[PDB]
Amino acid sequence: ACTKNAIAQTGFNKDKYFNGDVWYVTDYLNLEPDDVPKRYCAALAAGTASGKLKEALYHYDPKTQDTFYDVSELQVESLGKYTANFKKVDKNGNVKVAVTAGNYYTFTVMYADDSSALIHTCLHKGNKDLGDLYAVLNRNKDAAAGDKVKSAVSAATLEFSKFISTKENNCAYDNDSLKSLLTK
Numbered sequence: 178a179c180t181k182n183a184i185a186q187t188g189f190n191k192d193k194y195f196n197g198d199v200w201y202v203t204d205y206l207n208l209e210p211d212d213v214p215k216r217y218c219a220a221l222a223a224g225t226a227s228g229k230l231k232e233a234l235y236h237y238d239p240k241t242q243d244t245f246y247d248v249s250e251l252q253v254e255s256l257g258k259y260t261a262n263f264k265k266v267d268k269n270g271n272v273k274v275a276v277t278a279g280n281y282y283t284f285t286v287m288y289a290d291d292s293s294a295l296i297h298t299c300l301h302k303g304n305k306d307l308g309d310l311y312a313v314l315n316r317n318k319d320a321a322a323g324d325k326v327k328s329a330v331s332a333a334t335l336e337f338s339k340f341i342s343t344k345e346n347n348c349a350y351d352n353d354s355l356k357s358l359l360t361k
């Protein structure tokens with residue numbers, strides 16, 4: 178179950194965040210800790226494609242090799258707060274699991290600048306959810322979390338020390354697929 182109404186960044190700059198480029202997850206915190214593995218790789222692209230607000234997601238479990246991509250049309254709830262559908266696709270955008278009622282995530286940008294961000298998501302997939310999930314993002318897949326984003330974690334009344342890093346998993350991404358998936 179999700180429990181947090183995440184507050185979007187004051188003065189969030191949507192066009193900068195949704196610029197078509199890739200964001201890498203460097204650290205994450207699930208409030209239901211057993212909802213997700215302790216080793217994981219994730220990234221997304223975010224942009225407007227032919228007037229439509231889009232995200233493309235990538236998930237990879239570096240131990241099991243479980244891999245999946247998704248394409249998401251985002252609807253606006255308020256500035257920096259979205260409800261995303263999702264269809265599971267291969268890396269080329271071919272549909273594996275169509276959009277359906279009941280499969281959606283919320284997505285809140287709590288903090289962002291040109292290089293870093295803090296987001297919250299609540300996944301609903303069936304009558305189930307994947308509890309509250311916070312993620313620290315960077316444009317540079319190898320970047321240690323800096324002071325702007327760590328301060329934002331504190332301002333959310335969270336402890337960065339509890340976040341799990343993705344950096345020791347040999348994560349390798351297909352940026353080209355993420356960018357192209359925005360159009361799909």
Ligand code: HEM
Pocket residue numbers: 202205212213214216217218219220221234236245246247263264265274281282284298300302307310312
């Ligand atoms: C970057 C922000 C993220 C978003 C928006 C997001 C969104 C999603 C979505 C939409 C799905 C379902 C995909 C499908 O069935 O087609 C999913 C599944 C999953 N995500 Fe994330 N995710 C994010 C990051 C993460 C991170 C950092 C982890 C940490 C391990 C994670 C763990 C999982 C797991 C384990 C599943 C499979 C759930 C299941 O079907 O049992 N995700 N995520």
